[PDB]
Scaffold this motif. Structure first.
Motif, mmCIF file in Angstrom:
data_model
loop_
_atom_site.group_PDB
_atom_site.id
_atom_site.type_symbol
_atom_site.label_atom_id
_atom_site.label_comp_id
_atom_site.label_asym_id
_atom_site.label_seq_id
_atom_site.Cartn_x
_atom_site.Cartn_y
_atom_site.Cartn_z
ATOM 1 N N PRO A 147 -7.689 -6.666 3.587
ATOM 2 C CA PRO A 147 -6.851 -7.773 3.100
ATOM 3 C C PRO A 147 -5.389 -7.707 3.567
ATOM 4 O O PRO A 147 -4.772 -8.752 3.758
ATOM 5 C CB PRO A 147 -6.942 -7.639 1.571
ATOM 6 C CG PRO A 147 -8.219 -6.917 1.336
ATOM 7 C CD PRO A 147 -8.320 -5.944 2.469
ATOM 8 N N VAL B 41 -10.264 -1.019 -1.939
ATOM 9 C CA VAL B 41 -11.241 -0.221 -1.177
ATOM 10 C C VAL B 41 -10.568 0.995 -0.512
ATOM 11 O O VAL B 41 -11.101 2.117 -0.542
ATOM 12 C CB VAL B 41 -11.992 -1.110 -0.157
ATOM 13 C CG1 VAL B 41 -12.607 -0.294 0.973
ATOM 14 C CG2 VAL B 41 -13.081 -1.892 -0.872
ATOM 15 N N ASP B 42 -9.384 0.774 0.046
ATOM 16 C CA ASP B 42 -8.610 1.849 0.687
ATOM 17 C C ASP B 42 -8.185 2.919 -0.313
ATOM 18 O O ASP B 42 -8.266 4.108 -0.022
ATOM 19 C CB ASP B 42 -7.407 1.305 1.476
ATOM 20 C CG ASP B 42 -6.566 0.330 0.684
ATOM 21 O OD1 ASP B 42 -7.138 -0.609 0.090
ATOM 22 O OD2 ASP B 42 -5.332 0.493 0.665
ATOM 23 N N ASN C 186 0.866 -1.157 0.000
ATOM 24 C CA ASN C 186 0.000 0.000 0.000
ATOM 25 C C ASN C 186 0.903 1.206 0.000
ATOM 26 O O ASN C 186 1.830 1.294 0.815
ATOM 27 C CB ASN C 186 -0.865 0.057 1.248
ATOM 28 C CG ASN C 186 -1.690 -1.186 1.436
ATOM 29 O OD1 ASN C 186 -1.176 -2.219 1.840
ATOM 30 N ND2 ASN C 186 -2.978 -1.090 1.152
ATOM 31 N N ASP D 167 -9.550 -5.577 -3.825
ATOM 32 C CA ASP D 167 -10.704 -4.680 -4.018
ATOM 33 C C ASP D 167 -10.373 -3.191 -4.080
ATOM 34 O O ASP D 167 -11.241 -2.377 -4.407
ATOM 35 C CB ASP D 167 -11.768 -4.938 -2.948
ATOM 36 C CG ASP D 167 -11.242 -4.762 -1.524
ATOM 37 O OD1 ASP D 167 -10.225 -4.065 -1.322
ATOM 38 O OD2 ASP D 167 -11.863 -5.331 -0.595
ATOM 39 N N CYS E 203 -4.124 -4.971 -3.225
ATOM 40 C CA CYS E 203 -5.173 -5.794 -2.652
ATOM 41 C C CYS E 203 -6.237 -6.060 -3.717
ATOM 42 O O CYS E 203 -6.254 -5.424 -4.765
ATOM 43 C CB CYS E 203 -5.798 -5.102 -1.454
ATOM 44 S SG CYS E 203 -6.439 -3.466 -1.845
ATOM 45 N N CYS F 264 -7.418 -1.127 4.784
ATOM 46 C CA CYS F 264 -7.166 -2.197 3.834
ATOM 47 C C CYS F 264 -7.256 -3.499 4.592
ATOM 48 O O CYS F 264 -6.269 -3.993 5.147
ATOM 49 C CB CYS F 264 -5.802 -2.044 3.177
ATOM 50 S SG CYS F 264 -5.486 -3.302 1.925
HETATM 51 ZN ZN LIG Z 1 -6.818 -2.599 0.214
#
Ligand SMILES: [Zn+2]
Length: 87
Positions: free
Chosen positions: A76, A57-58, A37, A55, A53, A74
């Motif tokens: 995952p 999402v973060d 990340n 998805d 990851c 995050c």
């Molecule tokens: Zn993530």
């Protein structure tokens, strides 16, 4: 003045000062397994700019800057960024 707290696998690894006239830089979290990340601090705001990851999402959450905001998560990678007061 606020600070962002980066926690991964239940360890707080970095605290970033969030200064309005502050610098703009990236900080890469990368595990041995390749999970990563990329954190971006831009003055008084912070986000995950990039990640691998499943998805994102973060990444999709974008910037936060205030203590009350839902933490960047995050799940995952078991990684979290929360903003808090300088206490
Ligand atoms: Zn993530």
């Amino acid at each position: 003045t606020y600070q962002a707290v980066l926690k991964v696998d239940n360890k707080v690894i970095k605290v970033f000062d969030l200064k309005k006239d502050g610098p703009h830089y990236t900080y890469k979290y990368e595990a041995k397994d390749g999970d990563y990340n990329l954190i971006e601090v831009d003055g008084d705001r912070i986000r995950v700019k990039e990640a691998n990851c499943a998805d994102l999402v973060d990444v999709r959450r974008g910037w936060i800057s205030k203590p009350g905001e839902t933490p960047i998560a995050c799940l995952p990678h078991n990684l979290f960024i929360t903003v808090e007061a300088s206490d």
